[PDB]
Amino acid sequence: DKNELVQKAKLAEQAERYDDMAACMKSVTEQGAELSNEERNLLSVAYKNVVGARRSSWRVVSSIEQKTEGAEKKQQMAREYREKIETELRDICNDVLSLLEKFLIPNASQAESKVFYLKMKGDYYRYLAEVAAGDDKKGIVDQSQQAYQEAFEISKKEMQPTHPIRLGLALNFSVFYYEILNSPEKACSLAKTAFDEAIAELDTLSEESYKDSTLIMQLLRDNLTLWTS
Amino acid sequence: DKNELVQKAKLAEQAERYDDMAACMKSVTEQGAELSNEERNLLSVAYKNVVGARRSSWRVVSSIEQKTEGAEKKQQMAREYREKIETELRDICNDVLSLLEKFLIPNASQAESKVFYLKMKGDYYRYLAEVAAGDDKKGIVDQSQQAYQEAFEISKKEMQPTHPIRLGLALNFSVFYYEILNSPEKACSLAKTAFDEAIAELDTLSEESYKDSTLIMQLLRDNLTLWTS
Amino acid sequence: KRQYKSIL
Amino acid sequence: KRQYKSIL
């Protein structure tokens, strides 16, 4: 039953066994019923760590491969290893994207969950864009941007500027502009507006989520500081 | 070829992909030729991290299972999950122990490598002892102690008291006495003698390994401090 | 190693 | 979480 798999996912998280956590949460999602906020967060944490391990390995192996320019045997070994890690990463992203298309997005009957999932779709296309072949990149970048843009419109209409999901979407979409589209001014503008609109309506913070909101606001401003410096 | 697998293991280590690192080093060991110092260290680092992840998960899940005494459904879930992690851990230990028996120990033609491998055998039986059924525990504890004792005799005869492998063996064997045999006085005695005999012949440190030796000496003394406090 | 952050 | 250490 669903509740047992969720409890198993919480145990796996504590044990730092993210593949087990992800398998539990994917089994829960596959039952087809709309996820609770808690279940949604567990699925997200599991996959973030599963793909995260590959993103980090990819950065390390990519850096080595560049440093070994003019070192034939070493460079080739690093290229092939990078390609192996890339394959794993793409499979993970595609698995999440498939859950999003088959279950999560169509069953989302609430604005908050629609935004969360569309943001997640933007993130996972963004992770695919980080490793995309020059030829596939455009399409992948477009899919990420459209998912974030749709999430953005809904959050702007339905949520207060201090809502953590609205703030987290602005944070990740601003990073998408900066790192993926190489548009630092649209990145800064997006992050500044999100921060400023939250400060201007800080009385809308709730005692339940004010620390979640203010943490994301700190990240927005820190990125803004980095990017305007 | 062996050299390519070793280079692949170094790349995997950098990427923090220890299962890949272990598979490379196990393939190298299976070729049947005596390992170099570098190869021996790579095999050891790979397996230490592979089993390490399970030892850490086991401690976390064991702690939860104890905290959930009087909480039926939670306790049982934690027990079953602990049993699953235990199975993985035992398989890893048995895989290393099998390499040790089939290749490493019989091909060790040098005292230093004999000590290293016999110490490794003591360590992996010690990891099995940490998860042993009351009924299997005695035999496992005996196998760990005999491997450490044989390594100890050889190191005492062939190595200077400042040799890092001799010091590392004293450190792990002292931990075996303290944690596995519950004999803190023999643990302290073993650690104190090792530290004191190294201080007394510190002029035997080499510029190549003095920092490796002194690091292990710090660990010996820190354990001694903890255990005598 | 990236200076700017995304969520988490 | 163990206070005393083994190698590494």
Q: Token pair of A181, please?
A: 């589209």
Nearest-by-Cβ selection for A17 from B57, B64, B74: B57
Q: Token pair of A43, please?
A: 């699925």
- Determine, for residues B60 and A85 on separate chains, whether the beta-carbon distance falls below 8 Å: no
Q: Token pair of B107, please?
A: 């091909």
Sequence-distant (6+) residues with CB within 8 A of B66 are none
Tell me the resolution in Å: 2.2
Q: Token pair of A111, please?
A: 């604005």
Full residue range of the structural domain in which residue A127 is found: 1-229
A41 to A38, A72, A96, A182, B209: CA distances (angstroms) = 5, 45, 14, 30, 49
Q: Token pair of B143, please?
A: 């196998």
A136 to A43, A126, A128, A141: CA distances (angstroms) = 27, 13, 10, 9
Is B122 touching D (CB cutoff 8 A)? Answer: no
> Helix crossing, A111-130 with A72-99: angle to 10°?
160
User: In this structure, are residues A39 and A13 in contact, taking their beta carbons and an 8 Å threshold?
Assistant: no
Is B23 touching A (CB cutoff 8 A)? Answer: no
Nearest-by-Cβ selection for A48 from C2, C5, C8: C8
User: In this structure, are residues A86 and A80 in contact, taking their beta carbons and an 8 Å threshold?
Assistant: no
Q: Which chains touch B (3 or more CB pairs under 8 A)?
A: A, D
Is B72 touching A (CB cutoff 8 A)? Answer: no
- Residue of A165, A166, A121 lying closest to A144 (CA atoms): A121
Q: What share of chain D is helix, strand, coil (3-state, %, to 5)?
A: 0, 0, 100
In whole angstroms, give the CA distance from residue A176 to residue A168: 12
A·C CB contacts under 8 A? 26
- Classify A109 as helix, strand or coil: coil
CATH classification of the domain holding A137: 1.20.190.20
Q: Token pair of B117, please?
A: 């491998």
Nearest-by-Cβ selection for C5 from A48, A123, A222: A222
Tell me A101's DSSP state. I
Buried b (16+ CB within 10 A) or exposed e, B134-151: eeeeeebbebbbebbebb
- Determine, for residues B172 and D8 on separate chains, whether the beta-carbon distance falls below 8 Å: no
Q: Token pair of B119, please?
A: 């110490």
- How was it solved? X-ray
Sequence-distant (6+) residues with CB within 8 A of B98 are none
In whole angstroms, give the CA distance from residue A177 to residue B226: 53
Chain B residues near residue D1 by CB distance under 8 angstroms: 59
In whole angstroms, give the CA distance from residue B105 to residue B29: 11
Q: Token pair of A204, please?
A: 């809308």
Domain count, chain B: 1
User: Angle CA(B205)–CA(B40)–CA(B119) in degrees, nearest 5?
Assistant: 70
Of B5, B7, B13, B17, which to mutate for an interface test with A (greatest number of A Cβ within 10 Å)?
B17
Q: Whats the size of chain D, residue-wise?
A: 8
